[PDB]
Scaffold this active site. Structure first.
Site, short mmCIF file in Angstrom:
data_model
loop_
_atom_site.label_atom_id
_atom_site.label_comp_id
_atom_site.label_asym_id
_atom_site.label_seq_id
_atom_site.Cartn_x
_atom_site.Cartn_y
_atom_site.Cartn_z
N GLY A 1 2.59 22.74 2.08
CA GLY A 1 1.93 23.02 3.02
C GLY A 1 1.05 22.10 4.09
O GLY A 1 0.62 22.68 5.10
N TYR B 1 4.31 2.58 -5.61
CA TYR B 1 3.47 2.75 -6.88
C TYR B 1 4.23 2.98 -7.86
O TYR B 1 4.21 2.55 -9.07
CB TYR B 1 2.29 3.58 -6.62
CG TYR B 1 1.29 3.60 -5.19
CD1 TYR B 1 1.42 2.46 -4.45
CD2 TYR B 1 0.62 5.05 -4.98
CE1 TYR B 1 0.62 2.43 -3.39
CE2 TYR B 1 0.04 4.99 -3.63
CZ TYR B 1 -0.13 3.71 -3.01
OH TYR B 1 -0.90 3.79 -1.87
N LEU C 1 5.86 18.85 5.22
CA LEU C 1 4.46 19.11 4.97
C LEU C 1 4.60 19.40 3.45
O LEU C 1 4.74 20.45 2.95
CB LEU C 1 4.26 20.30 5.67
CG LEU C 1 4.23 20.08 7.29
CD1 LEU C 1 3.81 21.80 7.75
CD2 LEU C 1 3.05 19.12 7.48
N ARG D 1 -11.02 13.73 1.64
CA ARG D 1 -11.25 12.13 1.64
C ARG D 1 -11.97 11.90 3.05
O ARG D 1 -11.64 11.17 3.83
CB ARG D 1 -9.98 11.55 1.68
CG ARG D 1 -10.00 10.11 1.14
CD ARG D 1 -8.51 9.50 0.57
NE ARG D 1 -7.69 9.21 1.85
CZ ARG D 1 -6.43 8.57 1.77
NH1 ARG D 1 -6.01 8.69 0.14
NH2 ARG D 1 -5.66 8.13 2.66
N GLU E 1 -8.65 5.00 -1.63
CA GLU E 1 -7.97 5.67 -2.88
C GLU E 1 -8.82 5.33 -4.15
O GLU E 1 -8.61 6.07 -5.14
CB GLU E 1 -6.64 5.17 -2.97
CG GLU E 1 -5.61 5.85 -2.07
CD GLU E 1 -4.08 5.82 -2.44
OE1 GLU E 1 -4.05 6.23 -3.53
OE2 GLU E 1 -3.25 5.46 -1.80
N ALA F 1 0.93 -1.35 0.04
CA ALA F 1 -0.08 -0.08 0.02
C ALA F 1 0.62 1.27 0.02
O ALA F 1 0.32 2.12 -0.34
CB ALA F 1 -1.09 0.03 1.17
#
Length: 332
Positions: free
Chosen positions: A216, A84, A213, A295, A120, A79
């Site tokens: 941001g 990926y 981050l 999400r 996802e 995962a």
């Protein structure tokens, strides 16, 4: 008693699900994996049985266990994001091809499969609440290889759905939303389960590296305490009234919403106030970086099929997940 086959039991979900099931008097757990270091407290339990195995190497030995049990939970998958794009072919062979074989054993022997789909799959869906039965799935052009995980998992969902429609496969698909708590999976383990985002941040605090981050760290996510998440998975296994047959269920706490930065701040806070703080390096700070913005899950299906509602609040989950990690760290 119902025989539950947990493929890839050596981790987060395997440990918590097994504790839950063994707590009841009507379950027999077969935890298959290549190691058992994470579920050792269960090796001597009368109703737990460790099965040596690997879904990429074993064919027959897994088919045999599918025929022997009643319910199958395939948790082996890669995962982690960088994978990926780093080793996409391996992520596809394992997550898609190898799991497809297990799906086919389930239809061949008429067993119930409880499959971990992924949040996802919704991709860049614009709905404020991702709905398993109504939201459209949005992904980028094929020249954006990061989507290969999402689309692979989505095709598998559709293939399971097709077996359900044409060959009587009994199933329930579940989509976890940043589950977290004690005994988090290792960041590079190929076992579905714990929020990689929070375990990376805790690792940051533990090792003294900065909390990156990205742009941001404004993108928001929903976090779920494993006590709430595993309770819902448990009820899916119960399947009271058979209400989970053919269903797709998001399992998350839509009230625990936070951006990567806010989550970072929340951990830092619980970290500084923690008793073992002095055994760890000083905070290295937030390092902005720049190479899905929402999400939020809809949980009506969980309400309906499971009479489930997440009970733990954000702070309790942050605190306990961090606490358990710090106290389990081998300072030597």
């Amino acid at each position: 008693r119902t025989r539950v086959l947990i493929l890839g039991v050596n981790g987060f979900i395997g440990n918590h699900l097994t504790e839950r099931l063994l707590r009841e008097d009507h379950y027999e757990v077969y935890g298959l994996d290549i190691g058992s270091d994470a579920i050792s407290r269960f090796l001597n339990h009368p109703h737990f049985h460790f099965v040596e195995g690997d879904i990429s190497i074993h064919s027959e030995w897994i088919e045999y266990h599918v025929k022997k049990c009643d319910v199958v939970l395939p948790l082996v998958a890669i995962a982690t994001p960088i994978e990926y794009t780093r080793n996409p072919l391996r992520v596809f062979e394992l997550d898609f091809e190898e799991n497809l074989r297990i799906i086919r054993y389930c239809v061949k022997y008429r067993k119930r499969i409880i499959f971990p789909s992924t949040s996802e799959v919704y991709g860049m869906c614009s709905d404020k609440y991702f709905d398993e039965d109504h939201s459209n799935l949005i992904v980028g052009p094929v020249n954006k290889p990061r989507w290969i995980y999402s689309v692979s998992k989505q095709l598998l969902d559709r293939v399971i759905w097709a077996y359900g429609e044409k060959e009587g496969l009994q199933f329930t698909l579940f989509r976890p939303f940043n589950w977290m708590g004690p005994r988090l999976d290792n960041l590079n383990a190929a076992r579905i389960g714990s929020s990689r985002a929070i375990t990376q941040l805790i690792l940051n605090l533990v090792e003294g590296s900065p909390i990156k981050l990205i742009d941001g760290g404004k993108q928001k996510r929903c976090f779920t305490d494993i006590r709430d998440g595993i309770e819902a998975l448990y009820r899916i296994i119960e399947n009271a009234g058979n209400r989970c047959d053919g269903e797709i269920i998001n399992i998350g706490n839509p009230e625990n919403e936070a951006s990567i930065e806010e989550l970072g701040e929340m951990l830092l806070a619980s970290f500084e106030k923690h008793p073992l703080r002095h055994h760890f390096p000083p905070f290295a700070g937030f390092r902005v970086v720049e190479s899905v913005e929402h999400r939020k899950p809809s949980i009506r299906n969980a309400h309906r099929c499971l009479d489930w509602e997440p009970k733990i609040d954000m702070q309790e989950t942050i605190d306990e997940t961090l606490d358990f990690f710090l106290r389990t760290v081998d300072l030597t």
